[PDB]
Each structure stands twice: as structure tokens, then as C-alpha cells.
Design a protein. Structure first.
Length: 94
């Protein structure tokens, strides 16, 4: 039927919800991550860090969740693990 995808929630923030993820396979795209993290909790917006010189993601990406409770699960599910052949670190950006 109709999902809704209301969105209209711009202005991302480091709010608890947000999940600090590093060592991510930049090779992917916002969409990819959005889903990859959707396995734990619903995602509203996908944020990614960028360097000044190199101008690359460097894995450092921030995932915005709907409910902090849901985020934690992910911050503990992927935290201290190996993905896409690269140890990924998760931590509540606060």
C-alpha cells in the first residue's frame, strides 16, 4: 500500500538517536547504508562525514534513527564486529 515516506525532517543532529559508525564501506551509497542499518531499526536520515583534503568519507558515517532504543541495538549489534571485510565501530554520537 502506501508507506508514507513523509520525511520532511531535515536538520539532522548528533541527538542520542544518531549512531556514530566508522570503518564503513564507502563503496556503498546512502541508500545501501539506510537499509544495512534498517535491519536493526527504522532509519530517517543518513549522514556521512567528509574530509577536507582527500575529500572522502573514510567510512566515518552517522546514522540517524527514529528511536534511540532502536539505535542502541545497532550500536551493540555491529559494534566490535567485521563487515565488508573491515572492522566496524559503532558508538552513540553524544
Amino acid at each position: 500500500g502506501s508507506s508514507g515516506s513523509s520525511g520532511m525532517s531535515g536538520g539532522l543532529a548528533p541527538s542520542k538517536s544518531t549512531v556514530y559508525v566508522s570503518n564503513l564501506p564507502f563503496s556503498l551509497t546512502n541508500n545501501d547504508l539506510y537499509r544495512i542499518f534498517s535491519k536493526y531499526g527504522k532509519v530517517v536520515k543518513v549522514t556521512i562525514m567528509k574530509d577536507k583534503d582527500t575529500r572522502k568519507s573514510k567510512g566515518v558515517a552517522f546514522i540517524l534513527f527514529l528511536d534511540k532504543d532502536s539505535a542502541q541495538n545497532c550500536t551493540r549489534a555491529i559494534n566490535n564486529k567485521q563487515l565488508f571485510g573491515r572492522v566496524i565501530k559503532a558508538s552513540i554520537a553524544i
